[PDB]
Amino acid sequence: KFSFSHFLYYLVLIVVIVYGLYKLFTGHGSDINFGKFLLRTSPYMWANLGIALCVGLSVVGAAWGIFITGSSMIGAGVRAPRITTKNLISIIFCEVVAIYGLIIAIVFSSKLTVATAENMYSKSNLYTGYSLFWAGITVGASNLICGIAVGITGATAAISDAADSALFVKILVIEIFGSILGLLGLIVGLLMAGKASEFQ
């Protein structure tokens, strides 16, 4: 774009492509692939570190949700403290849903053991290394996005209150709908994680 940052980011987009084509004309490009790297690392990449990320990122997702809510909370309260209790209710949804990631992180981090020197790349542990990220990133991202959606919707409700308290229940369904995915992703990910195995 007109800003140096975006132009810089668009600079190299084709440098790798041109080098690869030149090396394919030279011979090395034919020897370019990721399968070497797929089986070059260890599943400790794929298990040891693929755990805290989902927890932390769902945590910051609930963080953004609470950023959103807390404003509208006192925004509605200041004019009329007839809502304070009614204000401080759905926030707990965001507070709580964050721990779905901790659930799986803790329960499967228990399953962590030594990655066997033998069969580092077999159907025993590297498979489980894959599944570890997959599940963790999957659930964590789902949780972050549910958290942002619920926080924003809750703020929307918390600004639709000063008009009338009686309107609360009639519009109470939105967060009810939102929160289901927070458990849905959790269950699907935990299923896929349990069906597989650990470092073995």
Binding site: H28, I32, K36, F37, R40, T41, M45
Partner: protein
């Protein structure tokens, strides 16, 4: 067994994932570069009917 070992000088895996850290740094810095200062409260009107 790597794309290019010249990129490797005893560290062929050490920093290959050291980028997401800086990505998080910059994404946070985006809002760090943002703030509020609300001078209007930091000074008081000369005439009360102003505010």
């Amino acid at each position: 067994d790597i794309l290019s070992s010249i990129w490797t000088e005893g560290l062929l895996m050490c920093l290959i994932v050291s980028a997401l850290l800086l990505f998080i740094l910059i994404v946070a810095l985006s809002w760090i570069s943002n703030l509020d200062i609300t001078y209007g409260a930091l000074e008081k009107s000369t005439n009360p009917i102003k505010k």
